[PDB]
Design a protein around this ligand. Structure first.
Ligand SMILES: [Zn+2]
Length: 326
């Protein structure tokens, strides 16, 4: 993505974290912080545009940025355990790292199992008390978010094991089954099936509870993500504060990331080397690129200039969704 867009996303999310009351809104914003760090992992500040990836200056930028991702995860588990005030206290130390990292590269002119599992459970709580299709979709995407950030994680009772020993291997299938269920529930929440999606979340917490209890201690479909992009665009234009523009745009970048290797229902009989599928790859990369440019406008505070870019963004998702609509 764009380094300035994510760093100002971190700063704006740290700002809404201090203005939060319960642990859920601290957890969601902290996950939006981990979201901005993931999509801007391979980014590059405008100060370092002419340096090399092996340069010491750029090397320090990489670990200094992973220190930020590590600190975001530590604050997420504090927000996952319910320690709402110890998590907001960790956000205070988080702002010191974000500010010092931002200034050093200023424009010029997570991975914890128990945090995501407690996020999945807490997101299952916010799904059961959902009104419309928007919040169940966002919560289900936060579930796909937590499963993506804890992909290579490890339960506390299995770090000593072996990524080849079936005990850890059995943990890998049971967790990919979880991301599979989350994606199937998003597909129902995307098609407007509000009650059928919450019914899918019922059996989903069955998988979550059986998985969490087995390791406690002592994704995305193309049409599901495209309907998410289209639905998030509905939320963008019916809002007027930069944060909810930014959150919806990050859900758009979220939906484009989880369905990066996806395939429309019309194109699975083709090959990943046939140009009909190759045009689908660049055409989808054009979409994630436009979403990043609109986040930059929403991160700089330009609430309108970002919403203006969202209308032109809808022109791109509509032409893309129709050409692979079946
Ligand atoms: Zn990712």
């Amino acid at each position: 993505a764009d380094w300035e867009a994510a760093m100002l996303t971190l700063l704006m999310m740290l700002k809404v974290i201090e203005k939060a009351d319960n642990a859920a809104q601290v957890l969601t914003a902290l996950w939006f912080m981990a979201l901005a760090a993931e999509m801007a992992a391979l980014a590059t500040p405008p100060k370092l545009e002419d340096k090399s990836p092996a340069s010491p200056e750029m090397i320090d930028f990489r670990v200094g940025f992973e220190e930020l991702a590590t600190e975001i995860g530590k604050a997420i588990k504090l927000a996952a355990l319910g320690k709402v005030k110890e998590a907001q206290a960790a956000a205070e130390q988080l702002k010191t790292t974000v500010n010092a990292h931002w200034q050093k590269y200023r424009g010029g002119g997570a991975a914890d199992w128990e945090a995501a599992m407690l996020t999945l459970l807490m997101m299952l709580k916010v799904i059961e008390k959902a009104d419309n299709a928007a919040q169940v979709l966002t919560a289900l995407w936060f579930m796909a978010l937590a499963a993506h950030m804890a992909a290579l994680a490890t339960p506390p009772k299995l770090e000593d094991k072996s990524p080849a020993s079936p005990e850890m291997i059995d943990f890998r299938v049971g967790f990919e089954e979880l991301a599979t269920e989350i994606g199937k529930a998003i597909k129902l929440a995307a098609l407007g099936k509000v009650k059928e999606a919450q019914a899918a979340a019922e059996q989903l917490k069955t998988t979550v509870n059986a998985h969490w209890q087995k390791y406690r201690g002592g994704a995305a479909d193309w049409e599901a993500a495209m309907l998410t992009l289209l639905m998030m665009l509905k939320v963008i234009e019916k809002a007027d504060n930069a944060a909810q523009v930014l959150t919806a745009l990050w859900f758009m970048a979220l939906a484009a990331h989880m369905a990066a290797l996806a395939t429309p229902p019309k194109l699975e009989d083709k090959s990943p080397a046939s140009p009909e599928m190759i045009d689908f790859r660049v055409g989808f990369e054009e979409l994630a690129t436009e979403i990043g440019k609109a986040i930059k406008l929403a991160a700089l505070g330009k609430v309108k200039e970002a919403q203006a870019a969202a209308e032109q963004l809808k022109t791109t998702v509509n032409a893309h969704w129709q050409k692979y609509r079946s």
